[PDB]
Amino acid sequence: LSNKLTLDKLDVKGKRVVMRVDFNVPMKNNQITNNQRIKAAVPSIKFCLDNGAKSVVLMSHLGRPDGVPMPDKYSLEPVAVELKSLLGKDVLFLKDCVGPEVEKACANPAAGSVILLENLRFHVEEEGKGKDASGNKVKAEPAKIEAFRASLSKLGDVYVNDAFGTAHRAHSSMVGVNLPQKAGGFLIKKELNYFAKALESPERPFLAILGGAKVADKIQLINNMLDKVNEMIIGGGMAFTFLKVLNNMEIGTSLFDEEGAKIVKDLMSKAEKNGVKITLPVDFVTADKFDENAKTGQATVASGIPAGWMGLDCGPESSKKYAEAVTRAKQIVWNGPVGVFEWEAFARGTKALMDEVVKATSRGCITIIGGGDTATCCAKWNTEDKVSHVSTGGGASLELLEGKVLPGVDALSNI
Ligand SMILES: Nc1ncnc2c1ncn2[C@@H]1O[C@H](COP(=O)(O)OP(=O)(O)O)[C@@H](O)[C@H]1O
Ligand SMILES: [Mg+2]
């Protein structure tokens, strides 16, 4: 960022600001479970308003609608409502993010107008791909992508990107906006500065804790991370891929990444060569279906998971092994709950791991927890202030740990 235009050097007096934020907040039945990512953008938004912005037009994705409109499942409308509360200002919600009606509402707003656009991923051109409404994979057309970007660019005179949590995504709203000044917000500044200091020479041992459910994405990041860390917990939804390939463990209907499976053995060889201690769980809480009211069971690696059942949390021997890796660390980066922590039957391991990480912070371990869902763990159990840093970035944070530049940063104007 030292090299890039940032919002503190952007003259906004009388300008419309179009601002990409990560408002991809966790939900249960169109209710916001954690407004952390919303609050995190407020400093950038208030700056613009305080310094005389004509308008701030906010844009984000929510979940993975795959390029089809899904207002019933994936609308940002609840986020506009929560934003109102957080800003003390009213927020005009629009039901689309591009096209003539949107351009019109954004062309010349009343001074101080805050506008939140609908889910960008209701359009295929944001990601550059998705699925048609029948579930068949489609790829977007370049001339349509270009038009999508041109339409977004009409909505502001100047562009800010404060979407740290999405900064690893080279999507239209993140790298494609064509305006003369493209400036990083304060949340991006705050996050890049923390990780720059913490990644420069990590305290050792440096433990990465990888869990969660986006197994196809995350498994592809392990290879570079193995040059940076001394230990790695591979837990949550990611473990099953590894145990299937390594132990031939019967995993039931647990998450499994078919492509990921093909590099597991390569990753474990690299880990052995780099002296990275891999800790996989050894036991599970199982469920007879993917429901919070499912019947619960126990499984071990040796027993396997029964057919039709899925592992949704680690068990007590796993928690103990996770605790011992946490006890040995001087620095930790954790992204991905180690169970379906949202559901109380499957929350105990993630809760146990959190208690250990809080303890560790107390004896001077540098502890970093990131992700839309992993940070919600901290909100759930009131630990946001009992670890060293809660980041709004999960996958974005792991890509920094890999040593990469984030495209959403790299696309900003130079100083
Ligand atoms: N064994 C599992 N099977 C399915 N989902 C899991 C498992 N363990 C954790 N999860 C889920 O992982 C999700 C979070 O994954 P992810 O989005 O990758 O993390 P973050 O948002 O912190 O980057 C949670 O919603 C949680 O329910
Ligand atoms: Mg997530």
Numbering used by the authors: 2 to 416
Which of the paper's sentences describe this entry?
Phosphoglycerate kinase 1 (PGK1) is an ubiquitous enzyme expressed in all somatic cells that plays a central role in glycolysis where it provides energy in form of ATP through the reversible phosphotransfer reaction from 1,3-bisphosphoglycerate (1,3-BPG) to MgADP in order to produce 3-phosphoglycerate (3-PG) and MgATP in the presence of free magnesium. PGK1 is a monomeric enzyme of 417 amino acids formed by two distinct α-helical domains of equal size, the N- and C-terminal domains connected by a hinge region. The N-terminal domain binds 3-PG or 1,3-BPG while the C-terminal domain binds MgADP or MgATP. Two different crystallographic conformations of PGK1 have been already identified: the partially closed conformation, able to bind substrates, and the closed conformation, the catalytically competent state.
Residue 189 is part of the 189–201 α-helix, the structural element that represents the hinge connecting the N-terminal 3-PG binding domain and the C-terminal ADP binding domain. Another form, defined as open and that is the most populated conformation in solution, has been detected through small-angle X-ray scattering. It is interesting to note that all the mutants crystallized in the partially closed conformation but only M189I crystallized even in the closed form, suggesting that for the variants R38M, G166D and V216F the closed form is less favourable in the crystallization conditions. We solved the structures of all these mutants in the partially closed conformation, and we succeed to solve the structure of M189I also in the totally closed conformation. The structure appear to be identical to the wild type ones; also the position of the two ligands, ADP and 3-PG, is conserved. Interestingly, in the M189I structure in the closed conformation MgF3- is not present, therefore the transition complex, evident in the wild type structure, is not formed in the M189I variant. Nevertheless, all the residues stabilizing the transition state are superposable between the wild type and mutant structure.
